[PDB]
């Protein structure tokens, strides 16, 4: 709450842009693991053990993704707006 | 009594049926030794998996800011492979480095000292179990039997793998990472447009993903979608 | 080096999906360290379980004599917690005691010396991993890392439980009742109409069920479906 | 083995007509359990033991089904044709 408020607008903007880039990089990475899990659960050629690994990946990534999103949300709050990320 | 409490923990772990029972057992051990928190961490590549009793807000910060690459404890764990004591009161600051920020934030969250049990797993996987305290010098590394500490770490590792195996989720019923991000931003008060600007997902597609999230969780509206997601611990 | 082969064993065990693969991994480690056979033993109060590569004739004698009660190796294993070297050479060679007969037989079966890794589990349960050799003295107890030794014992222990577990089949992977019937009648040379007439399943839906069966078994044609089903012993 | 050869056409036909109805009955019942088993596993709620009970019932039924169907096929071969049995 006060972790970011103490920074100036120009310091926050730089952090936000960087955090938004990570937010998107993680999204593309996680969505791909999920599609492989979804595909595998319908492929009779995959064993339960291999399938369980994909399930655990999805779960670990979900927790990390929420954490990074919470960190970005707090930055946004102190910044006041959503910067453009090219 | 440390090693005695350890043998007792080992028995408690064997009877533990779920994650909650393991936490109770680990927490009791922690208290008996003078600590108040524990954390199990597994790291493969850039992927970190945890099971702990550290405060929720610290997990968001640690996992969300990739502190695994700056934490002196993970660094210590791979430089040496045996039980060790560590204290933030040993990571000098004298500046505003990312290291001082990490140290001060850990302290503000009650993590000041601890003992860690490090084990190198298969395929370069790293795992460790640590007990932390907000006080300055709670060190049991001198009396903890090394072989028994490793045993405990392996037990926690496999017990968790076994409990994870007890639940087989069907991806068709789980929200995709896409739907998930849109659901969390909505829960944070962002419109479809603000969400699109954050995620890179088109504004109209965002609304479509929320609709899919609703069908998967049987919600009639987004406020309900959020309600049901909160109840299930999804978010 | 012993630890280099141990690190390899650990990776091999992680990848083991069944007992056969675990046995091959443990055999590779044993060979690399200068040993020939290995044996995992677990004692839970009364019952005793083992997973080993000792010769068939020696196992029948061992069980058919309850040699567990006299094996100096087991008695010593519970008498200590470090990796130790043992040799049948230190047991009675003359006289008529039961150990003298145990000595002669063990040696006649190639189990002359070895190193054993002992670990006390939960509830007083006892576990141990031994590597034996028909030779005079092959002793790695002085180079093997105590902590890794325990890690290895724990993996073998849990790996074996995660196998002794029930079969557990996936419905999606099994042929459904109406699918199995269409396939069997097809293998009997029946047409879709005769199959319908027999099972009650509609004619045009028969080919639909056959295509479904092919997908589950990964067959490009009905004749291949029959060949696969025959090989898996389903028809 | 081939004691169906010593049977008259009338005996064989009766055997086939009742074997066909039985065949159809087992199919209906077996399909129901399979679908239920399919549903249950599809639920992360149902426990492991309750999922195993359904698996065993499936493995057991599939066994009897094979035995019953093989027998019907032998009767039909000895008969030399497939009698028309109403639904
Ligand atoms: C989010 C849970 C993180 C667990 C991290 C871990 O295993 C090692 C550790 O104790 N790091 C300590 C030191 C300062 O803060 C910590 O948390
Ligand atoms: C046959 C399975 C028995 C395994 C017994 C075991 O773990 C300990 C052991 O190596 N005892 C040795 C010493 C002489 O004969 C043995 O077998």
XYZ file of C-alpha atoms and ligand atoms in Angstrom:
677
model
C 0.000 0.000 0.000
C 2.814 2.387 0.909
C 5.471 0.304 -0.818
C 4.939 2.150 -4.102
C 3.171 5.353 -3.043
C 6.566 6.630 -1.900
C 7.812 6.724 -5.496
C 7.354 9.481 -8.072
C 5.239 9.195 -11.215
C 8.271 8.731 -13.483
C 9.645 5.934 -11.272
C 6.279 4.208 -11.179
C 5.645 4.478 -14.912
C 8.923 2.685 -15.656
C 8.090 -0.085 -13.175
C 4.515 -0.427 -14.521
C 5.573 -0.755 -18.146
C 8.093 -3.409 -17.172
C 5.528 -5.229 -15.013
C 2.909 -5.143 -17.772
C 5.461 -6.703 -20.154
C 6.047 -9.539 -17.665
C 2.292 -9.910 -17.086
C 1.909 -10.584 -20.846
C 4.984 -12.814 -21.125
C 3.651 -15.027 -18.334
C 0.206 -15.082 -19.895
C 1.503 -16.383 -23.226
C 3.656 -18.968 -21.464
C 0.907 -20.236 -19.148
C -1.845 -20.303 -21.806
C 0.372 -22.605 -23.867
C 0.929 -25.057 -21.011
C -2.834 -25.070 -20.392
C -3.604 -25.830 -24.057
C -1.167 -28.747 -23.949
C -2.877 -30.017 -20.795
C -6.328 -29.632 -22.376
C -5.137 -31.408 -25.516
C -3.456 -34.215 -23.572
C -6.518 -34.970 -21.467
C -8.226 -35.969 -24.723
C -5.294 -37.955 -26.134
C -5.554 -41.679 -25.220
C -1.820 -41.859 -25.946
C -0.948 -39.975 -22.752
C -0.569 -41.732 -19.394
C -2.004 -40.499 -16.110
C 1.498 -39.687 -14.714
C 2.450 -37.476 -17.658
C -0.957 -35.842 -17.410
C -0.515 -35.149 -13.679
C 2.703 -33.271 -14.471
C 0.808 -30.911 -16.774
C -1.850 -30.418 -14.082
C 0.819 -29.513 -11.523
C 2.426 -27.083 -13.963
C -0.919 -25.344 -14.477
C -1.336 -25.077 -10.687
C 2.179 -23.746 -9.973
C 1.957 -21.228 -12.800
C -1.461 -20.026 -11.676
C -0.139 -19.120 -8.219
C 2.853 -17.251 -9.636
C 0.704 -15.481 -12.219
C -1.688 -14.203 -9.551
C 1.246 -12.946 -7.465
C 2.757 -10.957 -10.329
C -0.686 -9.570 -11.145
C -1.130 -8.468 -7.513
C 2.269 -6.753 -7.647
C 1.277 -4.957 -10.897
C -2.110 -3.992 -9.436
C -0.391 -2.277 -6.476
C 1.932 -0.357 -8.796
C -1.049 0.780 -10.885
C -2.780 2.003 -7.699
C 0.111 4.290 -6.766
C 0.699 5.386 -10.366
C -2.889 6.399 -10.958
C -3.218 5.133 -14.540
C -2.440 2.379 -17.028
C 0.566 3.401 -19.185
C 0.875 2.431 -22.853
C 3.160 -0.523 -23.431
C 4.551 -0.819 -26.976
C 14.126 -32.272 22.566
C 14.554 -30.904 19.045
C 15.352 -34.293 17.536
C 12.634 -35.687 19.772
C 10.075 -33.244 18.368
C 11.431 -34.205 14.941
C 10.683 -37.903 15.404
C 7.215 -36.883 16.590
C 6.748 -34.733 13.468
C 7.727 -37.683 11.285
C 4.910 -39.738 12.784
C 2.417 -36.875 12.438
C 3.329 -36.530 8.759
C 2.625 -40.191 8.044
C -0.924 -39.881 9.387
C -1.577 -36.556 7.642
C -4.374 -37.029 5.103
C -4.348 -33.553 3.560
C -2.473 -30.278 3.197
C -4.074 -28.794 6.285
C -2.867 -31.669 8.458
C 0.689 -31.284 7.177
C 0.686 -27.574 8.026
C -0.550 -28.279 11.547
C 2.204 -30.828 12.086
C 4.910 -28.586 10.636
C 3.637 -25.620 12.652
C 3.740 -27.564 15.925
C 7.337 -28.618 15.283
C 8.241 -25.014 14.470
C 6.811 -23.671 17.720
C 8.454 -26.344 19.866
C 11.850 -25.331 18.421
C 11.333 -21.592 18.916
C 10.194 -20.571 15.412
C 6.758 -19.470 14.266
C 6.755 -20.106 10.508
C 7.872 -22.671 7.935
C 8.224 -22.848 4.178
C 8.715 -25.637 1.713
C 10.153 -24.493 -1.607
C 10.834 -26.389 -4.804
C 12.632 -24.746 -7.727
C 13.078 -26.032 -11.281
C 14.518 -23.584 -13.785
C 12.641 -20.328 -13.282
C 9.637 -22.118 -11.806
C 9.174 -22.005 -8.053
C 6.570 -24.029 -6.151
C 5.839 -23.380 -2.476
C 3.932 -24.715 0.526
C 4.292 -22.458 3.552
C 2.901 -20.546 6.522
C 4.553 -17.238 5.631
C 2.056 -14.335 5.359
C -0.078 -14.210 2.203
C 1.084 -10.710 1.229
C 4.723 -11.818 1.397
C 3.989 -14.693 -1.014
C 2.541 -12.212 -3.514
C 5.672 -10.095 -3.239
C 8.132 -13.000 -3.286
C 6.483 -14.916 -6.144
C 5.472 -11.787 -8.032
C 8.872 -10.077 -7.973
C 10.989 -13.198 -8.645
C 12.792 -12.856 -5.294
C 14.025 -16.411 -5.795
C 16.892 -14.917 -7.816
C 17.935 -12.454 -5.128
C 17.171 -14.327 -1.860
C 20.491 -15.056 -0.043
C 18.906 -18.275 1.271
C 18.462 -19.952 -2.123
C 21.954 -18.756 -2.985
C 23.273 -20.335 0.221
C 21.420 -23.584 -0.483
C 23.243 -24.190 -3.778
C 26.689 -23.089 -2.607
C 26.493 -25.712 0.159
C 24.328 -28.805 0.632
C 23.683 -29.168 4.341
C 21.504 -27.642 7.061
C 22.300 -24.007 7.757
C 21.350 -21.020 9.833
C 20.752 -17.666 8.219
C 19.835 -14.195 9.431
C 18.927 -10.966 7.639
C 21.142 -9.431 10.309
C 23.985 -10.595 8.057
C 23.077 -9.047 4.698
C 24.527 -5.513 5.184
C 22.746 -2.696 3.349
C 24.421 0.729 3.328
C 22.428 1.734 0.243
C 19.224 1.201 -1.739
C 20.171 -1.989 -3.597
C 17.505 -4.575 -4.473
C 19.129 -6.603 -1.701
C 18.306 -4.040 0.984
C 14.748 -3.777 -0.276
C 14.377 -7.555 -0.104
C 15.834 -7.666 3.406
C 13.663 -4.877 4.784
C 10.483 -6.298 3.271
C 11.190 -9.784 4.619
C 11.736 -8.247 8.060
C 8.474 -6.263 7.867
C 6.718 -9.558 7.222
C 8.183 -11.277 10.271
C 10.934 -13.228 8.521
C 14.258 -12.327 10.118
C 16.112 -15.591 10.881
C 15.827 -19.276 10.240
C 17.343 -22.646 9.544
C 17.126 -24.224 6.115
C 17.465 -27.843 5.047
C 18.692 -28.000 1.436
C 18.409 -30.953 -0.931
C 19.339 -31.199 -4.603
C 16.671 -33.206 -6.394
C 16.478 -34.926 -9.752
C 17.308 -33.097 -12.968
C 18.760 -30.004 -11.316
C 15.630 -29.513 -9.218
C 16.241 -27.807 -5.896
C 14.166 -28.198 -2.774
C 14.358 -26.956 0.777
C 12.458 -26.753 4.014
C 12.990 -23.816 6.332
C 11.690 -22.635 9.701
C 11.657 -18.899 10.251
C 11.378 -16.467 13.138
C 10.978 -12.695 13.634
C 13.546 -12.818 16.460
C 17.302 -12.412 15.939
C 19.005 -15.724 16.746
C 16.946 -18.926 16.900
C 19.446 -21.545 15.730
C 18.865 -25.294 15.954
C 21.273 -26.140 13.114
C 23.814 -27.224 15.730
C 21.644 -30.014 17.174
C 19.418 -31.106 14.265
C 20.496 -34.513 12.977
C 21.449 -33.997 9.309
C 20.215 -37.392 8.085
C 16.910 -36.991 9.886
C 16.448 -33.460 8.522
C 16.879 -34.797 4.983
C 14.373 -37.568 5.742
C 11.825 -34.953 6.829
C 12.382 -32.948 3.636
C 11.847 -36.052 1.480
C 8.720 -36.975 3.451
C 7.197 -33.525 3.009
C 8.078 -33.656 -0.654
C 6.422 -37.002 -1.290
C 3.456 -36.491 1.042
C 2.611 -33.350 -0.927
C 3.047 -35.199 -4.225
C 0.671 -37.872 -2.922
C -1.997 -35.398 -1.828
C -1.715 -33.638 -5.184
C -2.311 -36.998 -6.854
C -5.502 -37.492 -4.861
C -7.131 -34.777 -7.001
C -7.358 -35.215 -10.771
C -8.651 -32.025 -12.375
C -10.229 -31.981 -15.852
C -8.853 -28.983 -17.819
C -12.216 -28.570 -19.567
C -13.650 -27.569 -16.189
C -10.786 -25.271 -15.205
C -10.495 -21.640 -16.256
C -7.691 -21.038 -18.766
C -4.914 -18.572 -17.906
C -6.685 -16.106 -20.214
C -10.039 -16.374 -18.447
C -8.232 -16.265 -15.097
C -6.488 -12.936 -15.780
C -9.725 -11.364 -16.984
C -11.542 -12.644 -13.897
C -8.932 -11.171 -11.527
C -8.850 -7.726 -13.207
C -12.639 -7.593 -13.043
C -12.432 -8.475 -9.330
C -10.112 -5.491 -9.063
C -12.575 -3.081 -10.600
C -11.191 -2.844 -14.139
C -13.547 -2.534 -17.108
C -13.147 -4.641 -20.261
C -11.224 -1.765 -21.874
C -8.786 -1.249 -19.000
C -8.324 -5.028 -18.864
C -7.599 -5.166 -22.610
C -4.938 -2.483 -22.196
C -3.241 -4.450 -19.440
C -3.447 -7.961 -20.901
C -3.173 -7.282 -24.616
C -6.488 -9.095 -25.095
C -9.036 -7.258 -27.254
C -11.792 -5.551 -25.210
C -14.551 -7.567 -26.874
C -12.636 -10.827 -26.435
C -12.287 -10.054 -22.714
C -16.076 -10.033 -22.370
C -16.138 -13.317 -24.291
C -13.651 -14.938 -21.858
C -15.713 -13.724 -18.899
C -18.720 -15.426 -20.548
C -16.772 -18.659 -20.876
C -15.593 -18.368 -17.269
C -19.255 -18.009 -16.260
C -20.340 -21.132 -18.155
C -17.524 -23.165 -16.575
C -18.470 -22.059 -13.042
C -22.234 -21.825 -13.691
C -22.493 -18.118 -12.866
C -25.305 -15.856 -14.084
C -23.272 -12.651 -13.790
C -19.716 -11.465 -13.218
C -20.353 -10.516 -9.577
C -21.434 -14.132 -9.139
C -18.439 -15.379 -11.102
C -16.254 -13.531 -8.590
C -18.274 -14.873 -5.648
C -17.926 -18.510 -6.720
C -14.246 -18.074 -7.584
C -13.610 -16.599 -4.127
C -15.470 -19.445 -2.398
C -13.435 -22.081 -4.262
C -10.135 -20.401 -3.476
C -9.410 -20.003 -7.197
C -8.705 -16.335 -6.492
C 32.916 -41.510 -8.951
C 30.425 -42.877 -6.451
C 28.604 -39.565 -6.058
C 28.577 -39.010 -9.801
C 26.806 -42.352 -10.276
C 24.534 -41.577 -7.313
C 23.396 -38.290 -8.906
C 22.681 -40.292 -12.047
C 20.677 -42.923 -10.078
C 18.563 -40.163 -8.584
C 17.638 -38.896 -12.059
C 16.953 -42.453 -13.249
C 14.648 -43.161 -10.301
C 12.601 -40.018 -10.918
C 11.953 -41.318 -14.447
C 11.103 -44.875 -13.342
C 7.446 -45.664 -14.060
C 7.465 -49.257 -12.795
C 9.427 -51.763 -10.727
C 11.271 -53.095 -13.749
C 12.700 -49.605 -14.408
C 13.612 -49.129 -10.747
C 15.447 -52.460 -10.759
C 17.435 -51.519 -13.886
C 18.397 -48.163 -12.361
C 19.551 -49.729 -9.085
C 21.447 -52.444 -10.983
C 23.352 -49.772 -12.970
C 24.354 -47.978 -9.795
C 25.413 -51.227 -8.113
C 27.518 -52.267 -11.126
C 29.167 -48.839 -11.302
C 30.209 -49.027 -7.666
C 31.691 -52.482 -8.000
C 28.711 -54.454 -6.680
C 26.509 -57.051 -8.340
C 23.194 -57.303 -6.487
C 21.018 -55.033 -4.390
C 18.161 -55.441 -1.972
C 15.589 -53.119 -0.493
C 13.883 -54.348 2.687
C 11.073 -52.745 4.669
C 9.958 -53.964 8.090
C 6.669 -52.673 9.482
C 6.425 -54.334 12.858
C 5.497 -57.889 11.932
C 5.399 -57.844 8.128
C 8.560 -57.646 6.028
C 8.650 -56.549 2.388
C 11.563 -56.626 -0.059
C 12.454 -55.516 -3.587
C 15.722 -57.112 -4.707
C 17.910 -58.669 -7.372
C 19.297 -61.499 -5.214
C 19.119 -64.943 -6.934
C 15.877 -66.927 -6.932
C 17.262 -69.996 -5.086
C 18.632 -67.826 -2.253
C 15.303 -66.025 -1.847
C 13.343 -69.255 -1.413
C 15.800 -70.421 1.244
C 15.827 -67.018 2.951
C 12.034 -66.900 3.237
C 11.715 -70.652 3.731
C 13.882 -70.327 6.837
C 12.813 -66.909 8.095
C 16.494 -65.929 7.976
C 15.330 -62.385 8.801
C 15.576 -63.473 12.430
C 19.293 -64.283 12.181
C 20.717 -62.095 9.419
C 23.535 -60.218 11.147
C 23.003 -57.507 8.529
C 19.448 -56.668 9.651
C 20.325 -56.844 13.356
C 23.185 -54.381 12.851
C 21.112 -52.095 10.595
C 18.690 -51.301 13.410
C 21.678 -51.013 15.744
C 22.967 -47.974 13.828
C 22.024 -45.160 11.447
C 25.066 -44.691 9.229
C 25.986 -46.510 6.021
C 27.996 -49.562 7.014
C 30.122 -52.294 5.448
C 29.613 -55.949 6.357
C 31.145 -59.261 5.309
C 29.913 -62.842 5.735
C 33.597 -63.601 6.431
C 33.176 -62.354 10.020
C 30.581 -65.025 10.806
C 31.083 -68.618 12.155
C 32.818 -70.890 9.644
C 33.030 -73.874 12.004
C 30.494 -75.333 14.422
C 26.805 -76.059 13.936
C 25.120 -72.773 14.902
C 22.426 -71.383 12.556
C 24.750 -68.504 11.558
C 27.374 -70.931 10.269
C 24.785 -72.414 7.931
C 23.656 -68.888 7.068
C 27.245 -68.006 6.206
C 27.908 -70.993 3.921
C 24.633 -70.507 2.025
C 24.928 -66.730 1.595
C 28.423 -67.113 0.160
C 27.375 -70.028 -2.039
C 24.793 -67.649 -3.494
C 27.224 -64.814 -4.188
C 26.156 -62.648 -1.226
C 29.532 -62.376 0.522
C 29.966 -58.680 1.424
C 28.178 -55.375 0.990
C 27.177 -51.970 2.276
C 23.783 -51.237 3.796
C 21.948 -47.902 4.192
C 19.686 -48.059 7.283
C 16.850 -45.631 8.038
C 14.197 -45.715 10.755
C 10.882 -44.548 9.341
C 7.580 -43.631 10.922
C 5.967 -45.737 13.661
C 9.150 -47.702 14.290
C 9.094 -48.966 10.713
C 12.513 -50.055 9.443
C 13.960 -49.608 5.961
C 17.299 -50.457 4.386
C 19.062 -50.634 1.036
C 21.947 -53.009 0.507
C 24.416 -53.535 -2.333
C 26.137 -56.921 -2.278
C 29.154 -58.500 -3.932
C 30.499 -62.061 -4.214
C 34.022 -60.633 -3.802
C 36.170 -60.193 -0.697
C 35.867 -56.485 0.060
C 34.043 -53.775 -1.902
C 33.379 -50.912 0.511
C 32.006 -47.506 -0.507
C 30.770 -46.628 2.986
C 33.747 -44.295 3.319
C 33.072 -42.237 0.185
C 29.268 -42.312 -0.075
C 27.599 -39.135 1.200
C 25.423 -39.876 4.291
C 22.701 -37.389 3.341
C 22.405 -38.466 -0.312
C 22.303 -42.061 0.870
C 19.177 -41.225 2.893
C 17.679 -39.261 -0.006
C 18.170 -42.330 -2.199
C 16.593 -44.670 0.369
C 13.625 -42.353 0.660
C 13.062 -42.165 -3.100
C 13.143 -45.921 -3.460
C 10.738 -46.204 -0.528
C 8.204 -43.749 -1.940
C 8.700 -44.855 -5.528
C 7.725 -48.399 -4.516
C 4.589 -47.188 -2.717
C 3.652 -45.188 -5.821
C 3.470 -48.492 -7.710
C 2.134 -50.893 -5.124
C -0.916 -48.656 -5.461
C -4.013 -49.979 -7.251
C -4.137 -50.078 -11.048
C -6.537 -47.158 -11.640
C -7.852 -47.007 -15.202
C -9.028 -44.003 -17.199
C -12.584 -44.463 -18.596
C -11.700 -42.343 -21.626
C -8.943 -44.820 -22.476
C -11.182 -47.884 -22.210
C -13.560 -49.037 -24.919
C -17.191 -48.496 -23.983
C -19.590 -51.468 -23.861
C -21.287 -50.657 -27.178
C -17.884 -49.940 -28.770
C -16.430 -53.243 -27.592
C -19.406 -55.108 -29.065
C -19.266 -53.471 -32.467
C -15.570 -54.326 -32.657
C -16.051 -57.956 -31.613
C -18.811 -58.519 -34.163
C -16.603 -56.875 -36.774
C -13.849 -59.328 -35.852
C -16.480 -62.023 -36.359
C -16.992 -60.791 -39.902
C -20.406 -59.234 -39.281
C -21.646 -56.253 -41.295
C -23.048 -53.093 -39.703
C -26.617 -54.263 -40.392
C -26.136 -57.750 -38.928
C -24.413 -56.143 -35.933
C -27.370 -53.803 -35.469
C -29.810 -56.677 -35.805
C -27.843 -58.493 -33.082
C -27.032 -55.736 -30.557
C -29.916 -53.328 -31.041
C -27.440 -50.560 -31.843
C -28.533 -48.661 -34.951
C -26.842 -49.619 -38.226
C -25.467 -46.220 -39.267
C -24.283 -45.597 -35.702
C -22.223 -48.794 -35.788
C -19.562 -47.330 -38.050
C -19.603 -44.313 -35.751
C -18.732 -46.505 -32.764
C -16.028 -48.291 -34.769
C -14.402 -44.967 -35.634
C -14.551 -44.090 -31.929
C -12.876 -47.380 -31.039
C -10.128 -46.654 -33.565
C -9.397 -43.272 -31.972
C -8.963 -44.813 -28.507
C -6.647 -47.505 -29.836
C -4.952 -45.303 -32.436
C -5.808 -47.476 -35.438
C -6.110 -46.221 -39.000
C -8.475 -49.009 -40.096
C -10.832 -51.672 -38.757
C -8.408 -54.501 -39.591
C -5.758 -52.683 -37.530
C -8.297 -52.109 -34.764
C -8.812 -55.880 -34.534
C -5.047 -56.496 -34.517
C -4.492 -53.987 -31.690
C -7.465 -55.274 -29.660
C -6.198 -58.838 -30.087
C -2.710 -57.836 -28.892
C -4.067 -56.028 -25.834
C -6.262 -59.035 -25.110
C -9.578 -57.205 -25.339
C -11.228 -59.345 -28.005
C -15.992 -77.662 -27.529
C -18.229 -78.525 -30.488
C -21.170 -80.179 -28.733
C -23.401 -77.652 -30.490
C -22.990 -79.774 -33.620
C -24.993 -82.599 -32.053
C -27.918 -80.249 -31.442
C -30.917 -79.983 -33.729
C -31.776 -76.781 -35.579
C -34.731 -76.300 -33.220
C -32.526 -76.537 -30.097
C -29.883 -74.241 -31.584
C -32.446 -71.668 -32.691
C -34.014 -71.454 -29.259
C -30.560 -71.124 -27.700
C -29.706 -68.297 -30.100
C -32.967 -66.439 -29.631
C -32.483 -66.346 -25.865
C -28.722 -65.714 -26.139
C -29.451 -62.688 -28.336
C -31.856 -61.148 -25.791
C -29.351 -61.785 -22.996
C -26.656 -60.177 -25.157
C -28.848 -57.088 -25.573
C -29.639 -56.976 -21.855
C -25.988 -57.101 -20.744
C -25.140 -54.379 -23.251
C -27.762 -52.000 -21.864
C -26.685 -52.644 -18.271
C -22.954 -52.518 -19.008
C -23.285 -49.286 -20.985
C -25.043 -47.683 -18.010
C -22.241 -48.532 -15.581
C -19.525 -47.421 -17.996
C -21.208 -44.044 -18.526
C -21.641 -43.671 -14.773
C -18.003 -44.600 -14.253
C -17.183 -42.069 -16.961
C -19.176 -39.434 -15.058
C -17.839 -40.265 -11.591
C -14.162 -40.061 -12.558
C -15.032 -36.855 -14.387
C -15.844 -35.517 -10.920
C -12.899 -34.452 -8.715
C -15.310 -34.894 -5.780
C -15.917 -38.663 -5.795
C -13.211 -40.403 -3.721
C -10.674 -42.958 -4.926
C -12.403 -46.028 -3.391
C -15.741 -45.014 -4.922
C -14.029 -44.737 -8.296
C -12.328 -48.104 -7.884
C -15.629 -49.809 -7.126
C -16.906 -48.578 -10.498
C -13.738 -49.680 -12.265
C -13.921 -53.191 -10.874
C -17.586 -53.495 -11.817
C -16.534 -52.449 -15.306
C -13.662 -54.953 -15.481
C -15.958 -57.697 -14.146
C -18.859 -56.967 -16.505
C -16.537 -56.742 -19.498
C -15.303 -60.232 -18.622
C -18.774 -61.806 -18.500
C -19.663 -59.930 -21.664
C -16.758 -61.514 -23.540
C -17.691 -64.980 -22.334
C -21.382 -64.496 -23.151
C -20.676 -63.040 -26.594
C -18.190 -65.782 -27.526
C -20.810 -68.397 -26.673
C -23.460 -66.648 -28.771
C -21.057 -66.558 -31.705
C -20.492 -70.312 -31.419
C -24.241 -70.980 -31.344
C -24.779 -68.810 -34.425
C -21.951 -70.592 -36.267
C -23.483 -73.999 -35.528
C -26.916 -72.638 -36.470
C -25.814 -71.211 -39.805
C -27.815 -68.007 -39.661
C -28.953 -65.164 -37.449
C -32.555 -65.469 -36.234
C -34.630 -62.289 -36.262
C -35.276 -61.214 -32.675
C -37.658 -58.281 -32.001
C -36.720 -55.276 -29.842
C 6.833 -17.220 -0.440
C 7.437 -18.316 0.395
C 8.929 -18.093 0.145
C 9.839 -19.150 0.769
C 11.307 -18.854 0.480
C 12.269 -19.899 1.099
O 12.025 -21.066 1.107
C 13.584 -19.363 1.716
C 13.535 -18.273 2.768
O 13.243 -18.682 3.884
N 13.754 -16.979 2.325
C 13.550 -16.085 3.488
C 14.605 -15.127 3.800
C 14.048 -13.630 3.773
O 12.556 -14.033 3.390
C 12.283 -15.290 3.240
O 11.233 -15.717 2.962
C 16.427 -62.168 -0.413
C 15.934 -60.812 -0.017
C 16.732 -60.697 1.288
C 17.302 -59.294 1.531
C 18.081 -59.245 2.839
C 18.691 -57.861 3.139
O 18.174 -56.845 2.788
C 20.040 -57.859 3.915
C 21.180 -58.719 3.395
O 21.665 -58.293 2.354
N 21.481 -59.879 4.097
C 22.549 -60.577 3.329
C 23.712 -61.077 4.069
C 23.907 -62.651 3.827
O 22.636 -62.818 2.866
C 21.932 -61.769 2.605
O 20.989 -61.764 1.923
